[PDB]
Amino acid sequence: SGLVPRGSHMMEILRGSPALSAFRINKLLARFQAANLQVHNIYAEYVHFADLNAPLNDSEQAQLTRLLQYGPALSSHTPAGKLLLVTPRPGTISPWSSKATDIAHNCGLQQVDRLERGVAYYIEASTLTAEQWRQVAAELHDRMMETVFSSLTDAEKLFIHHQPAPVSSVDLLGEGRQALIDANLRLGLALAEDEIDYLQEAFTKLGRNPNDIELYMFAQANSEHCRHKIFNADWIIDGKPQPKSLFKMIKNTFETTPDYVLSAYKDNAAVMEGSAVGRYFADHNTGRYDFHQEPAHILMKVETHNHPTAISPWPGAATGSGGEIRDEGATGRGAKPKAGLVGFSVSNLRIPGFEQPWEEDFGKPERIVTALDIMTEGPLGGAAFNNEFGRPALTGYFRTYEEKVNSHNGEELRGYHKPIMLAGGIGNIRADHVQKGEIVVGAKLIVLGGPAMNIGLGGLDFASVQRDNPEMERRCQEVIDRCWQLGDANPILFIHDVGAGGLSNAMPELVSDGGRGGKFELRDILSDEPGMSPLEIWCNESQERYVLAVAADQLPLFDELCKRERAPYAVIGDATEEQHLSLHDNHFDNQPIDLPLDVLLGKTPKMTRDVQTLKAKGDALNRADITIADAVKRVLHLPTVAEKTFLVTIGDRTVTGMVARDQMVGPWQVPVADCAVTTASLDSYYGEAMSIGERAPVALLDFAASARLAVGEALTNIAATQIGDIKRIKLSANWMAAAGHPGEDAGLYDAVKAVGEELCPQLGLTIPVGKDSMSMKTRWQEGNEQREMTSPLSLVISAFARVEDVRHTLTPQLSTEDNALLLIDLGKGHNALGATALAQVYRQLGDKPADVRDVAQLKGFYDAMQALVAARKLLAWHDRSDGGLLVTLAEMAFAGHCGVQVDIAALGDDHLAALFNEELGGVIQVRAEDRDAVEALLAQYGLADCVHYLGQALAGDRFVITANDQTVFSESRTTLRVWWAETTWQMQRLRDNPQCADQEHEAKANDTDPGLNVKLSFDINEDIAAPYIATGARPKVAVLREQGVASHVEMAAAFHRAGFDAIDVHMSDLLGGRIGLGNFHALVACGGFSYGDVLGAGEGWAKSILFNHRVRDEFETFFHRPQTLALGVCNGCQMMSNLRELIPGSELWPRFVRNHSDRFEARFSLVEVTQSPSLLLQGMVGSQMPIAVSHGEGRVEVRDDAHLAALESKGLVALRYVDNFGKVTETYPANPNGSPNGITAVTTENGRVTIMMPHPERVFRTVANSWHPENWGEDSPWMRIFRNARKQLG
Ligand SMILES: Nc1ncnc2c1ncn2[C@@H]1O[C@H](COP(=O)(O)OP(=O)(O)O)[C@@H](O)[C@H]1O
Ligand SMILES: [Mg+2]
Ligand SMILES: [Mg+2]
């Protein structure tokens, strides 16, 4: 390895492994050929750069070399041709770096200052000109995040040491107001005239010049994004002053319906009442996991990250998740995120080779990415954050819209060049932590989380490129968890997330919220960029940080908690009685900030918006080119309608072990569930539900109708879940608009009024949380002309509710038992076609849209559904939304893998309008014998005239719609289901391994697929551990975790149910002597993402054990005892595979590497239990049942065929993926990762150690299995693993 001077440090260069698989190499060659670049070949290798502060001895060097050997064993090539090295841009530090460097330090290599990675490309193309070489270089990197170098030695530039930049004053006293005008422009403060006035007067009064940092702080605090001026403005509309601000109209909902609300409008989440259940966590004193019966209240929040996503979609989406997760954890005095939701709105995809007939290229700004690139990289970023942090992502939306329409401001382009990138979720919170505490004078003021850099300052446009490190956030969440788990002894007095404005907002808002001042020391803040100015330090929008206040006497406890989780923290100030803000700098011996808080936090006048109504005249839908058959095909091809698998299986849906209802439904795992449901605890059937409603294109015709439909659809999506009182349902209202665009402002007011003053109070729905994003428009020059793309007003409503029994949830999976299909048409026969999917796919807007037709009937629908749910009278439910009744029926037939025979003669003479309107309502399926009773029930709620018997679900493949004796539409259901799949197919195909995309798609066309199905070799209800549990003797299990691991609570709970005392054992506990494995007879290594999988999944964890001789010895000793048991699941499996030199009987084990799909796979996969020595699978051999899978590096990799054959002949294979026909498979996704012979679990020769990629601990509860046979009780088959362990111990 290479090793040269790099300032007071030395940089080593270490070559890594091949970086690209053959499909990705071929994609690059095809792109160069399409661009007329004659490239003969391309080969890529990772290269690593280690900046060292001191030398490595030979042992240390071999350890560093070994740390940097990872990943799939692709065949190495001798470098040939031109080197292009792609690295992060100078001045940036990759999240890869942060994690890789933590691993080096936890392996005892303190001499590593920083590790970084690049990709060396070797291109053979002897005939290219210098210009053509620039296009090659352009193709090989992201211009927003990366740079191209011609030498490996050039990477020295990434580690340059910079001295701190000083504070700069702005010379108001020496130049007058012009100094503030110049700074306004130079610093991009975007100050209004009245804000310059305020600053001029404030600093004139103080008799000194403002520092740059003070102006920047002020400017960030007074932005639209931070201050919410529009939502607090007075209004005049069509010449009349209005009596309430938008915010006041939202609050009207809480004034009307306070019921069940614990916190609204006073934290960065709302809280509502949950259920009393067993909250499960490890005690601070004993480290044992135990249930604590108490209220688990429910917090909720939804945010957006629209602007940055248009510039750099992966970090835009990722930090959109990240910031929202921080709002949750910083609710009250600390709380715990549980589950997430995700939303995207973009312009037309225009997928190459799959362009649809409604799509026209209108151009875009050069500086933004395309809709397609947002829907490629954005979902992967948001999913990487949720996956790595560890919260399941269980509901969402994805809308495309880009058309030239005759809307409120006449003919113009309406769309989403600036996208909607929405992230939300729910969490649980303790009752006594809901209220933020008071901040005592002298409280210590702390930054919890990552060392900062000059990122995102004030929100090419590099300042819009964010940076995501979910593992850092998980480490912080663990600390928050330890704090709230101390109950009365929770040392957090107050906590807030660090978002816009960075510390410059978060710290002043924290002390101000306590009625205190603060004094701070700049040099106590953790930095990863020593060159930063005070302005940059204070104002940067670095991620994964929280601010909180702790009593000084609690610092030693806080320090212990942080050090055990490896969460970085710094005490950076003290709360003061005086309401003043001081920031000192010990390096420069000066005071960058010195301001009264009332000066800093003082406000210019309230805004007044004086505006006028515009309203579009609709035009009747021109039906010339429309036929029913062509419309069905088009609508199924609209992304908004079409199958969403590309957005679903990339995100974990099982972590926590509390997921009851995820997107995928039934044996064929079709993503049509209308809402998400989680259990409240690991020991309850009480729970929580989440749904979304949204209908933006309607706002191009009618602003209020669009907002009423968003609320209505949230209710119809949630309605077949057992909740009871509608007042249990709480909403977030997220408002996206192009404020100032003609007609939008009045429309915004009318829409807010429609829901806040009218619909929500009448229904009894509170909106206790919300947000707004008010510049949803993009402008650019397109040839000679000014062009503009403006969003419709886009309200997204998320609904959240406590659930009475998660078991009683209905899905769209039709039964073929004798049945009746009933439409509930809340449209009352209006059958509106304006602003539908139908209109859109023929490039039109139409006349009049749907709307809430009858408030009482909407409420009646909800209450009727709740009565039907609780009385178990529904077989299925699916609501009507995009694509109308047609799509509702279709989706039900897809989920039930069956046919329908329905008649629509009662729905009007206009069959197109009957099938494609998007009025509220839906289809219930009931047992035939219950039809009359169900109809009578609906009639009691005032709905008889809305209710229509359609027909029946039938076995087979026919989708038939009649009207009297005429066939209106008839098609193969398989044909329809494959058309509906084509969008996800094509997205998967361009994003992932196209072989896998193709396999997945083509399998959907085989109607003989029987779906997931079970074969059981044992009695799943027989608690073979009961006689042991009945003695009260409970063996310990070490539930092993590492920084970044999120799977440990539910792993503990599985062993707890089998009779174990589950002990929390962090790798810091072993390294610090607090736990020794000699005290345990069983160990489990848990899944998740230790170190964000950097340096190969499980490798850093394993090598941290191997390279500490003491801890290595401990592990070896444990594994060589005669009766000990060990289990490794997912990340634990990977870790243990990398530790196999310590494990007897493991010489034939494989490695676990990148899935063949090249994509994370969150699947509910069918496995069979195979004959092997494994003690943990005793009694289960020959069983076949599904299991949760959630991994990106689960592919079994062997050295050669000799190795595979030996492993197989030894008989150590314990689980294999099978297809639904029951055969061992390598076809995707039945086998999700490409493992040979379906291998996904191995054991040792003595059977005492078993490792597996799937997660049995996430599915030991029947209620947590996405699909399961109806006759199962509480226990799934997988419970037997943990029971076997207990019985084995005796
Ligand atoms: N962006 C997304 N991320 C994850 N899941 C999504 C996303 N968009 C849609 N889904 C899921 O795919 C399924 C179909 O979505 P959609 O048709 O938009 O729902 P609906 O029409 O019932 O409102 C649902 O289970 C939904 O939660
Ligand atoms: Mg839909
Ligand atoms: Mg729905």
Ligand SMILES: [Mg+2]
């Ligand atoms: Mg929807």
